[PDB]
């Protein structure tokens, strides 16, 4: 009797709004341009599945179309906020060691999880053995870098799809976005780009968790009286 | 509990080993299904035949395909595909036709829930290529709703038992096109000589259309 | 490629022949097929 | 449906 | 449409091809 | 009257620079490893320059320096490869320190 | 599969779909057509698709 | 009960289909969010293929009209001894200052190229700019 009203006022209400968390105010095409997000790899490194998201090549250097990045980033942040609102486990994954420390701190500060180390075989596909039969796996995996250190796709991309876990991923011009649920074409190498991404996801996640508490508290106060 | 398991192949594989000479292992192929469109298969390997059964059947339930069925009894359209050297040609059939297919296809079809279908296997008759080739073809069949949505037109089914009555089977959810589909006087579709030879009464086989037990 | 093999998956890996790398190496690890090549060619 | 012999005893564990 | 869009043309910064010491000499 | 991306790109200093070979740029040292200076100069990838022998102690984190660029990204395609191998760093020659 | 383009042309069903049954007067039909030219395309399709049906009937 | 066939459809299609078949008792936490706000492309595995023959990538080189002026300026006067500051988003190089003057004089009706280039150098010299010809 009271559960249907709970799930309808709290879990189903955010899903009826196009931007329930107002994540569009977090970034702009100018803010992305100043962070050098449009800078891609050389044309010789281009992945053919990244051609849709490329604006062009400036002297053999690919430029990422930030008009698309903004639309993809809106979807990626919106999804991430909704999963944080629903109390989902968000796992950040990246093998770029220049940013391992930064990413681990961003995860701890937002109350989420980070895996920036050597990804061991079967962490996702064999989790019950490695952690225990009652281990809960992540509900959302966010890739700040989708490639490993040998320039191949991070094993967790395939393993996330195997386990039916949606993935958010920054995909540079040399990356493969086919299996990434919410790809975001953008520069993953420049420190300014990576720092920006961490602020956006950290802020989106932190806002969504605070929104969940506000709604719950109001729903309880109104329930008693 | 809703899933049934069927064996498709049990093979004895012999591995030559550095110190122990020829050793005997078991490779098992099993298929699982619930009879309502969800079915899968997995290979099992072990020294004991019963450990291979456990591995295959337990692994297969984690690699389930969903198979779309027309009216929950047959496939949506004729399927002709090749997997490696194994060719499989499947034909959509009406109710009461039964499963007139390779015995392994019959077994898998009961697990999927297909009641009426014809299939002909040509080339290499490799159980594994046949099994994974069959699931590849059944998982890539376009439904009537997908065709209607893709072309934004009505799909109308004409049944000779129902005469000229037009039966709309699927309508596009989005807008409905106003321009008729172009009527190419002659379609440039490739035909199977086996299908044509039969329709012209030139197919003579003592083994075709033989009386068999209900399948 | 040529009959000389160049299929290595980690062909883009950065070759790092230094004294520190040898100490930070798995003892189980054994030299790969094309691992000697870099040594044969670096010596040259 | 049919029965396969059970692989091992659950007590045989740490 | 838009004035700031890129325009199609040949590389203006392209450098000449290399030439041997005897290129252009009998 | 919101500026478009095509507008930002046309008027960007990196776009206006043209080719990067033999272009003088100002970099900033952000990371140092022994005598290896990691310098960002506004591009996608940083460059790594060895500490100059003269006035080596003047090069510290935050020090702004003058560079002569050679390539924004060091990449090459090797025989039997479908893509380009990249070392993920720019090629630049360290000239000295920038002072006012 | 059946060899050639438009293998439907080599089926008894297709050949029986011709609607031109000449009167007994007709003894010889000569077809002069051009292999190239946009204005002779219908004549090429007539030779390609319909001559088989006419001869069958 | 599930499906690890990551190359068969997408996580949504496999989850939606197994939910319909009753194989999955409960929908995953993300399913309702994906349904409401789906991605632009459904994430389906694809195999990258290599182009052969007359197939070429559609990416186009980014060029501007002023790039012709920049190539000539670098040829005639070389790269300025002034250093580029790519951190300041409003930085103007000597070449950009030349290009802006070259564009202004073109809008005044001058159409010759060789004449429009020499008058621009004089204007900058009058303004105090150092233009040392390379040769
Ligand atoms: S380069 Fe040798 S003749 Fe021109
Ligand atoms: Mg990158």
């Amino acid at each position: 009797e009271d559960s249907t009203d709970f799930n309808d006022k709290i879990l189903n209400e955010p899903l009826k709004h196009s931007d329930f968390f107002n994540v569009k105010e977090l970034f702009s095409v100018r803010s992305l341009f100043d962070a050098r997000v449009h800078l891609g790899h050389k044309a010789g490194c281009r992945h053919r599945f990244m051609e849709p998201y490329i604006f062009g090549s400036r002297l053999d250097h690919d430029i990422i179309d930030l008009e698309q990045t903004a639309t993809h980033l809106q979807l990626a942040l919106n999804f991430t906020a909704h999963m944080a609102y629903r109390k989902g486990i968000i796992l950040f994954i990246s093998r770029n060691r220049q940013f391992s420390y930064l990413i681990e701190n961003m995860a701890r500060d937002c109350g989420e999880y980070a895996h920036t180390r050597y990804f061991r075989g079967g962490m996702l596909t064999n989790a019950r053995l490695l952690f225990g039969p009652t281990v809960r796996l992540p509900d959302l995996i966010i890739f700040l870098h989708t490639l490993n250190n040998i320039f191949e796709p991070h094993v967790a991309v395939r393993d996330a799809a195997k386990m039916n876990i949606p993935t958010v991923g920054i995909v540079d011009t040399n990356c493969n976005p086919c299996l990434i649920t919410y790809p975001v074409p953008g520069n993953d190498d420049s420190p300014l780009a990576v720092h920006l991404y961490c602020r956006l996801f950290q802020t989106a996640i932190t806002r969504a968790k605070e929104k969940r508490q506000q709604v719950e508290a109001l729903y309880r106060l109104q329930g008693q009286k | 509990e809703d899933f049934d398991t069927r064996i498709l192949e049990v093979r004895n594989v012999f591995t030559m080993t550095a110190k122990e000479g020829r050793k005997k292992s078991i490779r098992v192929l099993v298929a699982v299904g619930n009879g309502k469109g969800a079915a899968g298969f997995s290979i099992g390997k072990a020294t004991d035949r019963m450990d291979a059964f456990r591995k295959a059947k337990n692994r297969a339930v984690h690699h389930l395909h969903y198979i779309e069925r027309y009216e929950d009894h047959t496939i949506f359209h004729d399927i002709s595909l090749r997997f490696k050297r194994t060719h499989i040609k499947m034909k959509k059939q009406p109710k009461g036709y039964g499963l007139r297919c390779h015995r392994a296809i019959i077994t898998i079809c009961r697990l999927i829930g297909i009641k009426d279908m014809y299939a002909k296997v040509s080339g290499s008759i490799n159980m594994l290529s046949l099994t994974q080739g069959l699931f590849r073809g059944l998982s890539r069949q376009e439904t009537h709703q997908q065709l209607a949505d893709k072309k934004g037109l009505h799909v109308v089914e004409i049944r000779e038992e129902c005469g000229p009555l037009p039966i709309v089977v699927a309508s596009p959810r989005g807008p409905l096109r106003k321009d008729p589909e172009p009527e190419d006087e002659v379609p440039d579709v490739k035909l199977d000589w086996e299908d044509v030879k039969t329709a012209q009464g030139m197919k003579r086989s003592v083994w075709s259309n033989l009386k068999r037990a209900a399948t | 490629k040529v009959w000389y093999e160049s299929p290595s998956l980690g062909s883009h890996s950065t070759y790092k022949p230094s004294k520190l790398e040898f100490l930070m190496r798995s003892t189980s690890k054994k030299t790969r097929k094309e691992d000697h090549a870099r040594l044969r060619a670096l010596n040259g | 449906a049919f029965v396969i012999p059970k692989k091992n005893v659950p007590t045989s564990k740490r | 449409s838009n004035e700031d869009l890129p325009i199609s043309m040949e590389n203006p910064y392209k450098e000449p091809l290399k030439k041997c010491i005897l290129c252009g000499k009998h | 009257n919101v500026e478009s991306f095509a507008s930002m790109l046309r008027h960007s200093p990196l776009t206006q620079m043209g080719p990067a070979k033999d272009k003088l740029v100002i970099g900033r040292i952000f990371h140092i490893v022994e005598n290896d200076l990691y310098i960002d100069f506004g591009g996608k990838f940083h460059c790594v320059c060895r500490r100059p022998e003269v006035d080596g102690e003047k090069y510290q984190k935050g020090t702004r320096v003058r560079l002569r660029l050679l390539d924004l990204e060091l990449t090459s395609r090797f025989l039997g490869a479908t893509t380009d191998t990249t070392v993920l760093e720019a090629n630049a020659v360290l000239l000295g320190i920038q002072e006012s | 599969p059946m060899k050639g383009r438009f293998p439907i042309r080599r089926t008894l069903q297709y050949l029986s779909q011709g609607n031109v049954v000449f009167k007994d007067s007709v003894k010889v039909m000569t077809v002069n057509y051009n292999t190239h030219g946009e204005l002779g395309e219908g004549a090429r399709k007539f030779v390609f698709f319909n001559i088989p049906q006419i001869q069958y009937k | 009960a599930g499906s690890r066939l990551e190359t068969v459809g997408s996580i949504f299609s496999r989850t939606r289909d197994l939910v319909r078949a009753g194989v999955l008792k409960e929908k995953p936490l993300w399913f309702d969010v994906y349904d409401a706000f789906p991605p632009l492309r459904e994430p389906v595995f694809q195999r990258p293929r290599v182009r052969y023959g007359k197939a070429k990538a559609p990416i186009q080189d980014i060029w501007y009209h002023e790039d012709r002026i920049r190539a000539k300026f670098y040829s005639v006067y070389g790269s300025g001894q002034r250093a580029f500051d790519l951190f300041n988003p409003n930085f103007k190089s000597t070449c950009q200052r030349f290009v802006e003057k070259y564009t202004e004089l073109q809008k005044l009706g001058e159409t010759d190229e060789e004449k429009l280039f020499v008058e621009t150098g004089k204007a900058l010299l009058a303004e105090g700019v150092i233009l040392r010809r390379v040769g």
Side-chain angles (χ1 to χ4, degrees), chain H residues 98-122:
Chain H
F98 188 98
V99 171
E100 286 177 354
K101 184 66 67 174
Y102 183 108
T103 293
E104 283 172 18
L105 297 180
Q106 204 168 239
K107 288 168 179 174
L108 297 179
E110 179 60 46
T111 67
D112 184 13
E113 179 206 319
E114 302 167 16
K115 185 179 171 177
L116 190 53
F117 186 93
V118 175
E119 301 179 357
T120 303
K122 298 175 179 176

Side-chain angles (χ1 to χ4, degrees), chain B residues 24-206:
Chain B
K24 185 184 185 177
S25 165
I26 310 293
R27 196 188 82 173
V28 180
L29 176 55
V30 314
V32 298
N34 64 344
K36 302 186 291 294
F41 69 97
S42 188
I43 294 169
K45 293 180 180 179
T47 300
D48 183 23
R49 188 176 294 98
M50 311 308 297
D51 302 332
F53 291 153
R54 184 195 65 252
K55 294 178 190 183
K57 87 172 174 172
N58 293 348
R59 187 171 188 281
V61 89
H62 303 301
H63 293 81
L64 294 173
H65 307 244
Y66 184 81
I67 307 297
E68 290 280 13
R69 298 170 296 158
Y70 171 83
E71 289 177 358
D72 292 347
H73 80 89
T74 188
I75 58 175
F76 271 97
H77 51 84
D78 292 1
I79 296 165
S80 168
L81 86 156
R82 191 193 67 259
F83 186 98
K84 297 181 172 180
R85 294 286 90 207
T86 305
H87 302 74
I88 317 177
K89 294 177 178 56
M90 291 180 276
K91 292 181 177 180
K92 176 180 189 292
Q93 297 295 345
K95 294 186 174 180
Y97 186 90
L99 298 172
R100 295 177 47 185
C101 312
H102 184 290
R103 61 194 189 173
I105 300 176
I106 292 168
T107 292
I108 290 164
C109 283
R110 293 197 180 110
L111 296 172
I112 294 165
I114 294 162
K115 285 78 169 185
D116 309 285
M117 197 173 69
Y118 171 86
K120 182 69 179 81
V121 180
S122 296
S124 297
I125 319 298
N126 178 11
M127 189 61 60
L128 189 54
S129 292
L130 172 60
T131 300
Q132 68 192 332
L134 182 74
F135 276 96
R136 175 188 281 241
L138 287 172
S139 66
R140 298 167 179 186
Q141 69 183 311
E142 189 191 27
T143 67
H144 289 144
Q145 190 59 67
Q146 289 170 22
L147 184 64
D149 296 351
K150 176 167 73 191
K151 294 188 173 294
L153 295 170
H154 289 288
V155 185
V156 182
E157 172 174 76
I158 302 296
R159 284 178 169 192
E160 299 192 44
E161 62 260 31
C162 303
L165 179 65
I167 305 136
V168 181
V169 290
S171 306
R173 302 212 186 79
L176 182 59
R177 267 169 54 187
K178 294 276 177 178
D179 52 302
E181 187 78 36
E183 296 177 36
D184 187 2
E185 302 175 60
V186 191
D188 195 358
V189 300
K190 305 206 174 178
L191 305 172
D192 195 5
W193 173 231
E194 291 166 54
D195 292 334
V196 169
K197 190 167 48 170
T198 306
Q200 287 168 199
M202 291 166 65
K203 176 61 178 164
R204 305 185 170 80
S205 180
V206 303

Side-chain angles (χ1 to χ4, degrees), chain A residues 69-139:
Chain A
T69 302
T71 53
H72 287 78
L73 181 56
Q74 174 62 24
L75 285 166
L77 285 171
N78 182 81
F79 189 83
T80 295
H82 277 289
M83 292 304 298
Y85 179 93
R86 298 160 81 82
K87 303 182 166 168
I89 292 170
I90 305 175
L91 176 63
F92 293 88
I93 300 182
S94 169
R95 290 294 299 121
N96 188 341
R97 306 186 313 107
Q98 180 167 4
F99 306 108
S100 177
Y101 185 81
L102 172 85
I103 296 165
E104 283 180 335
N105 275 319
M106 174 263 292
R108 195 185 59 261
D109 300 338
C110 60
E112 297 300 354
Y113 305 88
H115 193 325
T116 67
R117 309 298 179 158
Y118 173 80
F119 205 85
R120 287 194 293 172
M123 293 300 292
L124 296 167
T125 72
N126 202 11
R128 304 195 179 193
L129 200 60
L130 303 171
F131 299 110
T134 61
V135 67
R136 189 181 159 192
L137 281 187
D139 304 302

Side-chain angles (χ1 to χ4, degrees), chain G residues 24-42:
Chain G
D24 300 313
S25 47
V26 179
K27 296 290 165 193
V28 182
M29 173 183 177
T30 60
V31 181
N32 285 77
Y33 69 105
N34 293 338
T35 50
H36 295 70
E38 294 178 351
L39 295 179
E41 178 65 2

Side-chain angles (χ1 to χ4, degrees), chain A residues 41 172-175 186-189, chain F residues 44-45 88:
Chain A
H41 293 261
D172 207 355
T173 75
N174 65 340
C175 301
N187 178 349
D188 59 4
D189 295 286
Chain F
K44 184 181 175 66
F45 296 105
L88 303 180

Side-chain angles (χ1 to χ4, degrees), chain A residues 14-15 17-18 34 36 46-49 51 53-59 62-63 71-72 75 78-79 82-83 86-88 125 136 139 158 160-166 176-182, chain H residues 3-7 9-12 14-15 28-51 57-64 67 70 86-87 89:
Chain A
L15 303 177
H17 304 288
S18 59
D34 293 331
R36 304 180 209 169
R46 195 192 298 117
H47 202 288
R48 92 172 284 168
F49 294 158
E51 288 169 3
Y53 310 117
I54 285 164
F55 183 84
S57 50
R58 178 63 177 176
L59 291 158
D62 285 335
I63 300 296
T71 53
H72 287 78
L75 285 166
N78 182 81
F79 189 83
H82 277 289
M83 292 304 298
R86 298 160 81 82
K87 303 182 166 168
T125 72
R136 189 181 159 192
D139 304 302
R158 175 199 76 198
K162 282 184 182 288
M163 305 309 297
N164 281 263
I165 302 170
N176 187 336
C178 64
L179 283 178
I180 297 163
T181 309
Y182 292 91
Chain H
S3 180
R4 305 189 174 195
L5 303 171
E6 82 286 17
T7 61
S10 65
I11 58 170
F12 181 71
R14 288 196 303 280
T15 302
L29 186 65
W30 61 266
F31 189 83
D32 288 333
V33 186
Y34 185 107
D35 215 4
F37 318 102
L40 293 170
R41 158 180 193 281
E42 177 184 78
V44 175
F45 171 83
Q46 293 281 294
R47 174 206 164 78
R49 184 194 314 272
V50 167
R51 284 180 174 84
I59 306 312
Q60 297 296 321
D61 301 344
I62 296 160
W63 302 123
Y64 300 102
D67 292 327
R70 299 209 181 88
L86 305 172
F87 298 90

Side-chain angles (χ1 to χ4, degrees), chain C:
Chain C
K1 68 189 149 185
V2 190
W3 316 303
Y4 297 96
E5 305 204 337
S6 311
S8 60
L9 173 63
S11 61
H12 312 290
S13 65
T14 58
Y15 182 44
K16 290 181 291 286
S18 180
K19 203 174 172 174
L20 178 62
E21 313 292 314
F22 172 92
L23 293 189
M24 302 296 107
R25 215 187 288 174
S26 309
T27 61
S28 50
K29 187 210 189 168
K30 302 188 190 295
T31 49
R32 298 215 64 189
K33 184 174 280 172
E34 293 299 320
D35 182 65
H36 303 77
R38 287 184 179 174
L39 296 172
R40 187 161 170 280
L42 181 55
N43 298 10

